[PDB]
Design a protein around this ligand. Sequence first.
Ligand SMILES: *[C@@H]1O[C@H](CO)[C@@H](O[C@@H]2O[C@H](CO)[C@@H](O[C@H]3O[C@H](CO)[C@@H](O)[C@H](O)[C@@H]3O)[C@H](O)[C@H]2NC(C)=O)[C@H](O)[C@H]1NC(C)=O
Lengths: 48, 49
Amino acid sequence: AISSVLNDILSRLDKVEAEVQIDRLITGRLQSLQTYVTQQLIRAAEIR
Amino acid sequence: VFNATRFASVYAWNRKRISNCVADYSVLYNSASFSTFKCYGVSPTKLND
Ligand SMILES: *[C@@H]1O[C@H](CO)[C@@H](O[C@@H]2O[C@H](CO)[C@@H](O[C@H]3O[C@H](CO)[C@@H](O)[C@H](O)[C@@H]3O)[C@H](O)[C@H]2NC(C)=O)[C@H](O)[C@H]1NC(C)=O
């Protein structure tokens, strides 16, 4: 995407070009939590 | 910029630097003269913000 700040996309783009950009961040970020929460669920099984 | 008497040949394409001034892009967007006004890292409305 054009920028790693959300509001610097949203101020600079319309309702459709922003949907193409923003969903990239929604993807990448979601995969960043889906990673992190997995990593914690496994560590948690280590500490358990 | 948009109203010089002559433009350059596209091999020697002239480049004018714009700086230390107010820009109102609605003047251009509202101009029924332009066949093409596509923006490539912003949207043409949001230019004013
Ligand atoms: C090239 O230069 C031209 C002269 O500056 C310019 O045309 C002028 O455009 C303005 C609007 O920005 C007009 O202003 C008048 O508009 C209406 C006309 O009905 C009036 O009700 C308003 O009160 C206002 O005075 C000028 O009338 C118009 N003049 C001429 C001779 O066309 C072009 O827009 C410029 N083109 C580019 C590409 O920049």
